[model samples]
Target: DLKASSLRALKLMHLATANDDDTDEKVIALCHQAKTPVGTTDAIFIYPRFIPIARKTLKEQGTPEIRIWTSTNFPHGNDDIDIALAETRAAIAYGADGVAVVFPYRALMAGNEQVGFDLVKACKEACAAANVLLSVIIETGELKDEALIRKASEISIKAGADHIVTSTGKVAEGATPESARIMMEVIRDMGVEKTVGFIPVGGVRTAEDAQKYLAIADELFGADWADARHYAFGASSLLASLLKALG
Candidate 1:
């Protein structure tokens, strides 16, 4: 069942990333074959110039279930808070189901957690009124210590992040089982609701990795995928491996 569900999720995600031209037809065909819905990417921010095209494509799909993820101050949140918030607002207005804002690594590393927390809090509030979920990217590789990771997790939760995600998958350092385990532990200890979930992205491959995360979820929260509010594997390659393993 996990395999099936995960595959379906991957299919939907793949459809979301489909292009908006002739080649898109192939993407649609794949979706039909998989019986999956549309999904999207976090590239809008990387290429902010494509926001209009991205929005037009999603509207054209008319599926009303497109998911767009943007990284704020992405990879490195060195920009001003105003700029990050503006970018986030633009992404939401352009038709994103959610916005993934990257944590200000500089601020965190500088022991200025409040700045990072406040920035996310403002972004969350901004997205909240717009009915958008703000997923925070921890960029675990940038964080050096477990205590800092735990602190960052708690700070984001308190600041009203809808979800806590690990890694941008861009850095040489990526998500690890150990990091996921610690992040989840901190989130649970903080007594955050299951609705506020966890996402472990970057370098996660194999069904074993996904299963390990699921096990962590079951151990801390509960087994109901719907009930289990706090865990998702953010991976592109892992899905294919999962399919092959299932076969």
Candidate 2:
């Protein structure tokens, strides 16, 4: 059955925010849950500084299904290309299965789509070399214009981004079905349906919200299209509560 958590395996359980000893335990809590520990569940998305902890833990778990997602630039996507590139490589160096970076978000909002496209392209190449997943966060909530959304989506897809994330979770708003719909439309128009992926992040903090977006994704992509490889829901409180609702 496609319960809310039917996508649980695709859930990138966010374990921690800061770099501290407690993060190690957060990794354990997420992985050691009676039957849903990371090894039995989704990607362990963590702050870059704390990626090593989860990476090491998943290594111990030894189940290839358990993977690590490292935030590359983070908060705001103002990091230079080289710095962000270094983090992407470092993320893989630490054994990350995927890397999500908030790059050129400001540029996208400022109508500098080329910078965003170029950055996504550069990072995509590095991630391709590392054989890691690449997500380009456009932070759509900040830019509510549908045309801008479509333009940015088109640019990133052409740049070879594996996934298009809607928000950074640091923004005032989160993912929206409308934004997802627009991005999906752009992807379909480009004929990259089965290739590129999409994720909704930020204010997707309630079951109703998650339900709405999940259906939007399934409708746009396919029924039960929850997989780390293709789709994901990124948020701390949302993942837990949505899982609880599914339970």
Candidate 3:
């Protein structure tokens, strides 16, 4: 049944919220859900400002170790590498267990793959030092071409990104099964299927909506590949939807 499956899939939901007016109380409420048995999400993606608050609540709760992840250069990946690196470092310093960076997709669009590689490399180095996970957001909505998506995935993976995400959810098109397939195929061909991860963000509105992407992952990566550590559904609304289905 969908209810049972949704409960099993709870940990795979990357509970997220990036609203401008989300207060400390609201974030704390989210943390409570993250630690609850029914809402045992492995990761919480929040604004940089709320990292400490989420960490504090989790620590005070005294159990259920959920990773705190935040985005840098979000929605748009046109920032200088130095600024992105600084943001990554700051997020790590504030106790983020993972940092997802919106890589410079425009550089690739302009026929400069090296820029994308260099930026991801720099971020991976910074994240590696602190043992924090680095997920490169390729913004697949902007890179609509299959070849471009493949190229972006290859560069990010080769540069040592722990994961390659599909979008920021701010784009007109969030993610599609087609784009996710290319990324998974890139990981397979690169011989890093086990080392790399894929997260489909943006349009995943419910547990039912995640079936298509999950099927692709299972077929490409194997039936038992997706866990909290290596895979997740990156949507702000997914958790609630999953919870509703469970009820």
* Best prediction by TM-score: 3
**Models sorted by lDDT, best on top:** 3, 2, 1
TM-score against native, each model: 0.79, 0.83, 0.92
lDDT tens digits, residues 1-247, model 1?
6665455334323222222222444434332322323333222222334444554555565543444455566767663788889988887776665678887866887878788888899899889999877888878888858987887788888889888887776776777878888988877787775558887776556766666666777677766642222445556456455666563
Full-model lDDT for every candidate: 0.64, 0.69, 0.83
For model 3, residues 74-97, the per-residue Cα lDDT tens digits are 758984889888988898898888
> Whose lDDT is higher: candidate 1's or candidate 3's?
3
Q: What are the runs in model 1 whose C-alpha is more than 4 Å off?
A: 1-66, 225-229
lDDT of 2 at 6: 35
TM match of model 2 to true structure: 0.83
| True lDDT of residue 168, candidate 1 | 73
Give the alpha carbon lDDT tens digit for every residue of 1-247 in model 2. Answer: 4363434523534433322224667766654441253324456566666666665656666644666677787767873788788878887787777888885766777767777777778888988987888988877887789988888788889889888888777777877778888887787689886788777776566667766766776676776554556777665665555556664
In candidate 3, where is summed lDDT lowest over 10 consecutive residues? Answer: 13-22
